[PDB]
RNA sequence: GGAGACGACGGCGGGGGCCCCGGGCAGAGUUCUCUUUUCUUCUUAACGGUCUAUCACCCUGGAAACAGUUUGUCUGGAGAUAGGGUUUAAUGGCCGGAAGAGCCCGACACUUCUGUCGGGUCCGGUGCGCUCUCGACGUCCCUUGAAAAUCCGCGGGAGGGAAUAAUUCUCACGCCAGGUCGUACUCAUAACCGCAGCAGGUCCCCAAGGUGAACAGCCUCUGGUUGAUAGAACAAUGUAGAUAAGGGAAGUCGGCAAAAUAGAUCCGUAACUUCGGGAAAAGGAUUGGCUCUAAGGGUUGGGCACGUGCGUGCGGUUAACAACCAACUUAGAACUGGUACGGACAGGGGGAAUCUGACUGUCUAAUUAAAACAUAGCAUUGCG
RNA sequence: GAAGCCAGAGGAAACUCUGGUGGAGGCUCGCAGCGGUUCUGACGUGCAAAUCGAUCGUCAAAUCUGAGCAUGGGGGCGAAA
């Protein structure tokens, strides 16, 4: 059926939520790899080794 | 419901005698309008003394620091000191009045 | 005031006369003697 | 420029021969952190929140590479 | 003692022009001693050298006729120049109508409150002039939908 | 095979910049009185990442009770509407560049050398606005509106290719190299030409505010000037600009010149005509200010039963209702000043006819702009 | 305000009328530009070996204009003076 104007405008709300959802998930990823940033350094070094 | 504190800051020309700070009090009370209307201050807008010639204002509404450097610019004027008195901001919500630069002739 | 033509000049790029200061001081009642303009005043 | 998001990316680079130099850049209104590092082609940027673990990665950077801490004057 | 140099470097470094390029009448000397730009900074910061501010043009007059203009001032008979379509084209209120007969249309399809088919019929009328604006629109529809409910009442 | 690679004009839509409106910090001005006031700074490059942007294309499905749709009537069984996707296109958002810059304000230091340290640089709105650019349409042609260098894609399958590992990978990072000139300044009421620092001539961009239909006229902001022999007096005759009682062309070869008309809204408009015009024909009514009224818009938002912020199965077209936001026109009424109301500026005198050339156009630079020339149409001649 | 298009009212239909839409024309008022009609105009050993003022024609095109190139005196070019 043809959708309505409140449809389509909760469909892009949907799609702006999960682009910032994405977004928060990569910044919660990078503050991740921040905390383990050592263990990632020692692995560099052996695999430069 | 905000808050928003003003000094006007008087301690050297009060000291000097040359800035009358219960003079400048009266002309704030009766000058500062609220709504677009003078003498409507209530409890919105209250003027005080702390001391040392300096001037409190403790404001509810979205009154500006501008407006009151205004109103003292404007009682510069009345009392013919607008072109020796300046009106400087010092801090944030602080308006400090100081003479001019003096040259020795 | 000429604000027609030109603006006028602002009152602090302008060093105020002490002799100037002291008169209008003294015609407003003043004394100037007691607070010291010479100490503030600049050379 | 360029912008890092992985901190092992930003590590390798930091550890390729044609890093000159580096520089930790502070933001407080803004509460981050960056770390410039001056390759030969591309110069690689890494956007941090303030924070210790991002003070302390200046212990996981290489010792030869030369960092410096950016002054709030870019003086001439 | 000629300044010329002086205040063409002064109105260079001040980013201004020569108009507006204050040098002090007590000071010529010192700031005719200066042959730089370096000196003609060192001076702009001693104060010796000033830029003038702007000459005042004001919008207040323009604001206010604005205002009165809005609540309907100043449109008379005696004040108007243009012809009526100079003023206020016949082919843009046009444009506007039909914009707006067309979205209501359209509205009133995707919220279901009318068919496909008296969709098309009020399309066409609507190109064809019926309505002259939104609530004439609106009575039409009503209207229509009055006479088909007393046709199904009466069937 | 594509790109390079292409006309003119018309309206419409998107984007940048400019203009305009509101709030805030800081500074400046005004201040008899008023003005929470007026003005100023508040910015973000190339190059990249990422998320999106009309056309178009693809999948499902098969439309008359025809439907979708633009300001403009085009599209569809050669597959529309609807639903879901894929892509050309950024001068759009965010991020890196990049605040460390630029800008504004303040406080110290300062024979010079020289500066030093703080605080900010923020948030919105609007549009028949101006300018550039992009896109989709449309109109016109007995007019159909460059070429090459250069770059890319495809067809083809010659060669070259691996487990001693190979790689002749348009991916990422890294290494090296980039020669010659020209670059000042003017571009014009003084830098060019006219014998000259000559009121002449000489090709382009960028183009603010107000009035107003308007890059009309007039005033103003930025930026520029204040440069063109001076001083005194106010005779005749001049050059330029004006007014004049009464009469109103009696002037003069001749209404030459001047005056009168003029913008906009409404009423109304003849003969003749190639039916297109004439026509703004003619002739009339009105226009200031103030206080109101009315009309013309945009955005968002519907109840159950389950699974669990979405998926179905239903149920309803009084949302014909609420909340928020928004700008310019049009019409009507009262009150009020008047010698004036398009108050300056700006801006058709009109009509009855005759001759004449069809019209638009062109020429005698430096005395003649026209019934001259050309033009479309028509007619004739020669050529296979 | 030309084709084209929409709607309403008639007509058996072709068409007729009414209200809109649209934006054509070597159309028209008019700014700049281009040109050069008139004035007992200014100027007349001039600012000028053709200039100045007002007024005027034209203003979406047979419009205006730069650079490069071609045509050379028994010639060229010429909407023909």
């Not at chain 1, 709300?13 to 990632?40: F, G, V, Y």
């Not at chain 3, 009152?11 to 004394?31: F, I, M």
């Not at chain 5, 470094?13 to 040098?23: A, D």
Request: aromatic share 6%.
């Amino acid at each position: 059926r043809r959708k309505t104007k409140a449809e389509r405008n909760r469909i892009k709300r949907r799609k702006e939520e999960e682009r910032k959802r994405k977004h928060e998930e990569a910044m919660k990823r990078k503050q991740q790899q921040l905390e383990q940033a050592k263990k990632i350094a020692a692995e560099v070094e052996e695999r430069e080794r | 419901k905000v808050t928003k504190k003003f000094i006007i800051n008087a301690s050297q020309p009060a000291s000097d005698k040359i800035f009358d700070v219960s003079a400048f009090e009266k002309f704030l009370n009766e000058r500062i309008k609220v709504d677009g209307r003078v003498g409507n201050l209530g409890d919105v807008i209250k003027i005080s003394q702390i001391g040392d010639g300096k001037v409190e204002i403790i404001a509810h509404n979205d009154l500006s620091g501008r407006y009151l450097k205004y109103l003292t610019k404007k009682f510069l004027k009345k009392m013919q000191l607008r072109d020796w008195l300046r009106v400087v901001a010092t801090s944030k919500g602080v308006y400090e009045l100081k003479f001019y630069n003096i040259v020795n002739d | 005031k000429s604000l027609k033509n030109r603006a006028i000049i602002p009152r602090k790029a302008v060093k105020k006369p002490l002799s100037q200061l002291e008169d209008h001081l003294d015609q407003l009642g003043v004394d100037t003697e007691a607070i010291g303009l010479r100490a503030r005043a600049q050379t | 420029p360029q912008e890092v998001s992985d901190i092992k990316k930003f590590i390798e680079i930091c550890r390729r021969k044609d890093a000159s130099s580096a520089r930790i850049k502070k933001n407080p209104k803004t509460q981050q952190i960056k770390f410039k590092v001056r390759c030969q082609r591309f110069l690689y940027t890494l956007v941090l929140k303030d924070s210790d673990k991002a003070e302390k990665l200046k212990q996981s950077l290489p010792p030869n590479l030369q960092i410096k801490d950016v002054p709030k004057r870019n003086k001439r | 003692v000629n300044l010329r140099t002086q205040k063409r470097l002064a109105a260079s470094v001040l980013g201004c022009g020569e108009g507006k390029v204050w040098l002090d009448p007590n000071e010529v000397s010192e700031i005719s001693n200066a042959n730089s730009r370096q000196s003609i900074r060192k001076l702009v910061a001693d104060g010796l050298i000033i830029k003038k501010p702007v000459t005042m043009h004001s919008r207040s007059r323009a604001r206010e006729l604005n205002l009165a203009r809005r609540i309907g001032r100043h449109r008379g008979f005696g004040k108007r120049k243009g012809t009526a379509d100079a003023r206020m084209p016949q082919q843009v209120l046009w444009m506007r109508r039909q914009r707006v007969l067309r979205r209501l249309l359209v509205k009133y399809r995707a919220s279901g409150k009318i068919d496909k088919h008296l969709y098309h019929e009020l399309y066409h009328l609507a190109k064809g002039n019926t309505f002259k604006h939104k609530r004439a629109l609106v009575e039409h529809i009503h209207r229509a939908k009055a006479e088909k409910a007393r046709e199904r009442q009466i069937k």
